[PDB]
Design a protein around this ligand. Sequence first.
Ligand code: F6C
Ligand code: CLA
Ligand code: CLA
Ligand code: CLA
Ligand code: CLA
Ligand code: CLA
Ligand SMILES: CC1=C(/C=C/C(C)=C/C=C/C(C)=C/C=C/C=C(C)/C=C/C=C(C)/C=C/C2=C(C)CCCC2(C)C)C(C)(C)CCC1
Ligand SMILES: CC1=C(/C=C/C(C)=C/C=C/C(C)=C/C=C/C=C(C)/C=C/C=C(C)/C=C/C2=C(C)CCCC2(C)C)C(C)(C)CCC1
Ligand SMILES: CC1=C(C/C=C(\C)CCC[C@H](C)CCC[C@H](C)CCCC(C)C)C(=O)c2ccccc2C1=O
Ligand SMILES: [Ca+2]
Lengths: 42, 42, 31, 74, 80, 753, 139, 75, 172
Amino acid sequence: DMTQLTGSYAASWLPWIMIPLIFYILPFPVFALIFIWIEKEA
Amino acid sequence: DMTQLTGSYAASWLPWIMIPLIFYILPFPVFALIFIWIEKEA
Amino acid sequence: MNISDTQVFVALVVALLPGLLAFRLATELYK
Amino acid sequence: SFMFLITWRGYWQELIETLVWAHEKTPLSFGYWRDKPVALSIVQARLVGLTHFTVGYIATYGAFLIASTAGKFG
Amino acid sequence: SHTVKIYDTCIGCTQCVRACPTDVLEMVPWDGCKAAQIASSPRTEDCVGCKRCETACPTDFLSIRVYLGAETTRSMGLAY
Amino acid sequence: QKVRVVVDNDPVPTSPELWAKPGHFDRTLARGPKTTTWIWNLHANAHDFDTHTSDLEDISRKIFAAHFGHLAVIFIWLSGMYFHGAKFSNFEAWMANPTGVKPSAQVVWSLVGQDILNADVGGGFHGIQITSGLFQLWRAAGITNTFQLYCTAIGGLVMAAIMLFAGWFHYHKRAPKLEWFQNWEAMMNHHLAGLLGLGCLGWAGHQIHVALPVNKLLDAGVAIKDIPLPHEFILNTSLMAELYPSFAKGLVPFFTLQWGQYADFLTFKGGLNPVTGGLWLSDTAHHHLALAVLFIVAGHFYRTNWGIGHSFKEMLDDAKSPNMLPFLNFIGPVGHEGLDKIFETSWHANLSIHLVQFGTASLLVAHHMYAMPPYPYLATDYATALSLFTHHVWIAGFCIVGGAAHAAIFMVRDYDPAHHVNNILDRTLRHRDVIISHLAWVCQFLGFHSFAMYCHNDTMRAFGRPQDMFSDTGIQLQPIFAQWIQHIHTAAVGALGTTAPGIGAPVSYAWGGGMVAVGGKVAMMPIALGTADFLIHHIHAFTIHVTVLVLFKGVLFARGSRLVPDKANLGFRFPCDGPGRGGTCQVSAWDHVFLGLFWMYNSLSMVVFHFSWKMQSDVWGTVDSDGIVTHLTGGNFATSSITNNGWLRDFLWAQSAQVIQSYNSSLSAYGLMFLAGHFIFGFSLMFLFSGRGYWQELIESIVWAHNKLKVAPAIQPRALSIVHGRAVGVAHYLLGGIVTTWAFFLARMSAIG
Amino acid sequence: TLEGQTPIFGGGTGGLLTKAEREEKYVITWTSPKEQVFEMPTGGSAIMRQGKNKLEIARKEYGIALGGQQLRAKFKINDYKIYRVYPNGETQMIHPADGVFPEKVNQGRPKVRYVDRNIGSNPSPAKLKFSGVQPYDAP
Amino acid sequence: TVPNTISWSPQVALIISASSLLILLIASRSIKYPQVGAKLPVLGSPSVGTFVASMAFGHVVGAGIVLGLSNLGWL
Amino acid sequence: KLNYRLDTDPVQPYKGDPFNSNFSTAITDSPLARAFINNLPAYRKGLTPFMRGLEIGMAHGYFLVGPEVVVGPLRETAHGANLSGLITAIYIAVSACLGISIFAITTFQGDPRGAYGSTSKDSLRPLRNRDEWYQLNGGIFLGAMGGAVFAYLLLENFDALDSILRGGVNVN
Ligand code: F6C
Ligand code: CLA
Ligand code: CLA
Ligand code: CLA
Ligand code: CLA
Ligand code: CLA
Ligand SMILES: CC1=C(/C=C/C(C)=C/C=C/C(C)=C/C=C/C=C(C)/C=C/C=C(C)/C=C/C2=C(C)CCCC2(C)C)C(C)(C)CCC1
Ligand SMILES: CC1=C(/C=C/C(C)=C/C=C/C(C)=C/C=C/C=C(C)/C=C/C=C(C)/C=C/C2=C(C)CCCC2(C)C)C(C)(C)CCC1
Ligand SMILES: CC1=C(C/C=C(\C)CCC[C@H](C)CCC[C@H](C)CCCC(C)C)C(=O)c2ccccc2C1=O
Ligand SMILES: [Ca+2]
């Protein structure tokens, strides 16, 4: 059916979790890591 | 039907929220304001 | 035919004017 | 890109100063800059504007190139 | 801070010192020109880099040169 | 005694010696050119009179004389329109068949194939279809033949010569003293009662005695030749009584205050004339007559020489705390006291206010003329209706930017801190960060909640989720307050109940009340407002607020800022204060005008785009015998204008078909000018994106080549100054963009209008 | 401590900010012959008192602009001094540095950042690679 | 309907004459600068400018009153 | 001849200092404005930093659920709309609390820059210690989660609450 995102390829559940992880789950922690890195006192 | 409070007047949802607000939502905060007012040290 | 929703809302907004002026008078009398 | 390329730095530095005043005088805004906000440098503005100009240049033509050919053929 | 250098072509016209908006420059005794004075930059920490001094300098080429360097609070002209 | 005429006799000799002395007005320019920058400076400072001399009296005399010169220019231009409409026009053919003939008053010669531009405009005539509305204006004035237009053309030339002599006379022979120019009360009294009041009365006389009788016959269907000349309605009083019975009573009802007798020709109908689609000429006659009385009465408000009247100084000095309203006392204990010094000495401050109000007036002209078409056969002439709205919108925008420009000039040059001590002007400058920061915030709120919701609509539509869009069929944003006003204004005339019983028809059919059609085309009909109108109106709110932010920041920070505290000493127009402080490019108030010009263009482009699309989609069209209206773009504004892909596709791409396919036809000039505008826009980007340091170095190598061949000029070539490059860039940018829209609008309307 | 009476000013938005209390602040003091209206460096008008005045300013350029372009040029006041005030209370007088205005030559002032050559004889940057020495700083 | 206007009658003359007279009594004793310019009893000795102003305003107010009354059937 | 008229000025210098970039206005210095602002949980005298965060989070988490319930992409069904609103409030609050954490990490190194330095006198930013910011952050997160869930429970049981507030539960 064409009412939902699906995948006929192997392990189609991988995009189901990797797209949220890379794009709106991990990026804020990654920004926090970089922000701490670029603000550290000498 | 006469199994519930209803209103044929305009904006009958107003008593639905205004009666709880004046009578058992806001009065305790109001009493808190008055209690602080009448106990303040000189 | 009683008043409409707009009339009730207008009265609520209009009543704010004596509401604020009552607060101004009450605090002024407290001085 | 036209904003970065046409408007230049001193206009934005004066505007940022006004926003700096507003933040300091607003209650409940507990945040405060560790790095003082300044307008982008003169050279940086040319680079940033050129980057937007180029990216828009490539994206606009790339979309048109693909759509006008793939829409009329395979 | 910015670096301000004065070269030997200075004629001691005092125009760079008068043009400086943050009092970076002063005129010191000298003997290389008829005016018997030369510009000096003892307070480059207060230099903002406006290059008003270079505009005022009448010699060709400039007797005073400003090289923009590390940016500080007062070199960026920040009141905050 | 206080108001008197004092002049100087022969203050400036009339000699052409200074004609051969370019730059004589400026001390620096008088020495002559050494570089090409001198040439540009000569033209840039030509009319900057306050830099020619510091004498305010001499400055004021230059203002007075130059204003006569500009009046002469306008009279020559007006004479040209009347002459071309009397010699190279199909005006007589159009007067016979207004609904089937295209107005045309420009004819081209046949030398290089440009005679193809002589379009088939009907009436057995070949020429360019004009969109200025001259024919509709002349018909409403009672003009019926080309001879009357020819007489007006000659009169315009005579008035141009009189204006030119007046400027020479009042500068070289009898130049008024500075005290004469400072009579605020006398000037207001004479310009209210004598200029606006007497002009309205004089035009009311022309309408009642000429325009109404001629137009009543025209709308009745009688031929041009059968209509008597306008003076016949004055001599033969029997003719004028047949048309309007009340003229049988003469002037008796006027002097006896029985004005109700005059109701037959001073009507109060409202609505539109069904025959022509314009406003009733009897309605406009009573309108102008009421204006004349109101203005003349207003002309006795100020105290000149007889004790009676109000004084500007007394009024201003009283408007302060605690004399204000209790909630308006924040203006401080000084208030408007000290503002009188501004109007004594600052011409720029007055120019700032007056340019703003021409922007207000021209905006009212644009909005009120499309919705209440005042001329016969104007509403159905879609080419003219679109051109008139667009032209006056653009004129208003330039005037508004000019008002902000000369407000900044006043602050830099004429403002004196000693005159403004804790007054409202001083207090405004002392909380300028308050004003600019709040204005910056509301600009971001408006931009997010107007434009980013269009981006929301584009993404939802692209996703195939129309239900999540901001639209009438999705998440609705109804402009309820504007809808409420339309209902109130329709119910006022009887079409918060009947608050204006005297008007029969609706004041404007755009608010409701019905539809008017003239020649099988819609003159005016209700303009419904939905979600698409809510979004576009808040686009206008966003763009206007940002244009205010750019200009008002420049005025408030013209003296200086936290970055450059002494910008006033640097002047109104300077490029920068160097790369220091991180970079101070475009800090002066002049660059805020320069940046504000772009934002005025961006704001007004969407205003005329909103007008053009909405009128073509929901108002203009053709009416069949059954009363069914098919619109020019088929009502696609509601569903297509809610995304900017719809603007790109259904407005820019779709409606540019006429101008893009105009080659090998009479509209080919619009096609050529369409590309011409695109060229100048791209050409301007060279000046805006670059800097003179590159160009000066490039000129060095070019000068080397000329030096190699002993052909280097003595006037050394210089790159344009930093400010000059910005001025050239913005001038070509606005010229290119406006010409592009001009050809886009006119080509489409000359074909389907 | 710095003595003087602040000019009559009703308040403004261009005054001191957090930087004055955190990093540094500047004070300009001068003596005027009469009470008169001057322009604050950051907008608005203020009234300087009859005696000796004291104005707190966010940046040193404000003092140079006020003292140089208004006090000296317009009001013929030549005794203005600019101090730098630190949050710890330390105050140092920075203008005029030695009591004599910089534009007037004064004995005992050394030459600072003077290059004993014309600007066209600066070495090429290729000669100074990896040495950390700028061409204008080269001997 | 067009508001009713009445033919000339002594009543409209009375209203205009009274309105001018009342304005003359008030203006000569209330305005800021009377007795300015060339001089013309119970009045404060108004100047020619004050008198012409009072009569002109008497016509303005009088016309408004008579038109307003006639419109409303004597209000 | 010079009259500033400051003594009768409705708008005075803020806190008697004319050079602190502020005015004494109805918004900044009126008795009602000061009473309301200074008694908000961010400024209320004597509150522990955790208790400040608990009240602030409680109020903010509660109302943050609403926007996605009514105009969100799951608004077609009541159960889905409530879940999306709860998740949106959780995501926003957790993002804010992450920003608060890294604010405390970077601001309080040595002597903090700006308004949080030792010599700063910013009356609008009174949390001058790193410990206070972490205690505030704990209250912010727990309050926001609790307020968001409280709004979620009321919206999920809206049919029961509607009968509750109309007396429909008194039929049987
Ligand atoms: C940090 C902290 C802080 C704070 C607190 O604390 C603040 C606050 C304020 C107040 C006061 C006001 C109002 C608000 C609003 O409405 O607006 C905004 C919005 C928002 C949304 C903002 C935001 C908020 C916060 C940031 C929150 C955060 C949270 C998150 C979630 C985190 C996340 C994290 C992760 C990791 C990513 C404002 C503002 C302004 N801003 Mg401002 N902020 C800041 C930050 C920042 C930065 C970074 C920048 C850069 C981008 C800027 C910018 C800006 C501008 C342009 C302007 C304007 O205009 C405005 C004004 O002035 O008016 C008047 N600003 N501010
Ligand atoms: C009732 C008297 C009267 C009238 C009608 C005017 C009209 C005008 N004045 Mg003016 N003025 C007056 C009294 C009057 N002034 C007095 C008493 C003073 C001294 C305080 C001034 C001081 C003054 C200054 C300082 C300036 C003006 C300017 C102007 C012009 C403004 C531009 C405009 O709107 O174009 C209107 C366009 C027109 C075509 C109007 C007609 C123009 C002619 C000259 C008017 C002729 C009318 C005359 C009664 C003949 C009528 C013939 C027929 C109808 C019977 C306008 C022509 C400005 C200007 O542009 O100067 C040139 C300007 O800078 N006036
Ligand atoms: C009644 C209207 C009016 C009047 C009397 C003035 C008067 C003045 N303005 Mg002003 N101005 C106005 C409207 C007006 N302005 C408007 C509407 C704007 C907004 C655009 C401005 C923007 C403006 C700026 C930004 C500046 C002035 C300046 C000046 C002063 C010097 C004039 C000057 O530079 O010569 C004009 C000399 C020129 C060479 C300009 C001609 C070139 C134009 C731009 C080309 C126009 C293109 C053409 C119409 C279409 C294409 C032509 C074709 C051949 C391609 C003078 C006091 C200057 C100043 O120093 O003030 C103190 C200044 O910097 N004004
Ligand atoms: C550089 C090579 C490259 C690129 C551009 C992409 C691009 C993409 N992958 Mg992918 N992938 C790659 C290599 C790459 N792949 C390899 C080698 C593997 C096997 C381990 C996978 C396994 C994989 C899975 C299992 C999935 C994707 C998915 C996707 C899509 C969403 C992004 C995502 O979830 O990443 C996921 C990325 C990984 C799981 C591992 C990526 C490993 C590569 C080698 C990292 C490369 C790092 C890069 C070179 C450094 C950049 C430097 C910086 C300066 C730019 C996107 C089209 C998703 C998809 O199909 O959505 C529809 C998805 O679910 N990828
Ligand atoms: C409120 C003023 C006003 C209005 C609404 C009109 C309306 C009209 N006039 Mg008219 N006119 C006016 C004043 C006005 N006039 C004055 C003062 C004169 C000269 C003394 C004339 C001279 C005149 C002639 C000679 C002709 C007209 C014609 C017309 C009709 C064509 C439409 C038009 O002109 O645009 C409508 C205009 C507007 C909507 C606005 C412009 C009016 C002024 C500029 C408004 C100024 C307000 C300003 C922005 C605020 C100032 C600041 C504030 C502090 C005071 C229309 C019925 C033509 C016709 O044949 O009629 C059918 C025609 O041939 N008029
Ligand atoms: C389309 C191009 C474009 C855009 C988007 C902007 C945007 C802006 N300009 Mg601008 N400008 C432009 C062209 C543009 N300009 C050009 C060509 C010029 C030359 C004349 C200027 C000259 C100019 C001046 C002189 C001024 C501005 C100002 C502004 C700001 C107005 C406030 C606002 O709208 O906030 C809302 C922001 C937007 C509408 C931007 C688009 C946001 C998108 C739609 C949503 C993004 C969603 C999300 C956040 C994305 C995050 C994803 C993550 C991965 C990054 C804003 C940042 C003014 C300003 O700063 O005042 C505050 C101001 O003074 N501009
Ligand atoms: C806006 C504009 C325009 C214009 C328009 C028009 C058209 C206007 C008009 C205007 C007018 C139209 C005006 C008028 C005026 C008038 C007057 C000023 C008059 C006067 C009169 C008198 C003074 C009289 C006298 C007498 C005699 C002679 C005898 C007996 C007694 C008596 C007293 C009655 C144009 C487009 C161009 C341009 C742009 C802008
Ligand atoms: C200023 C003002 C105002 C405003 C106000 C507002 C803005 C409000 C809001 C409010 C709000 C917005 C509120 C909220 C609140 C909240 C709450 C009250 C909550 C609670 C919660 C809870 C209780 C929770 C719990 C929990 C937890 C903790 C855990 C487990 C689970 C549970 C759920 C149990 C107005 C305009 C009116 C008027 C004027 C003034
Ligand atoms: C192109 C450019 C120049 C170069 C432009 C110059 C030097 C002006 C040249 C003007 C010419 C000489 C005017 C005449 C051009 C006509 C087209 C000649 C007509 C010839 C007839 C025979 C047809 C700048 O100087 C500059 C300065 C600052 C910012 C941007 C720029 C910039 O973009
Ligand atoms: Ca029960």
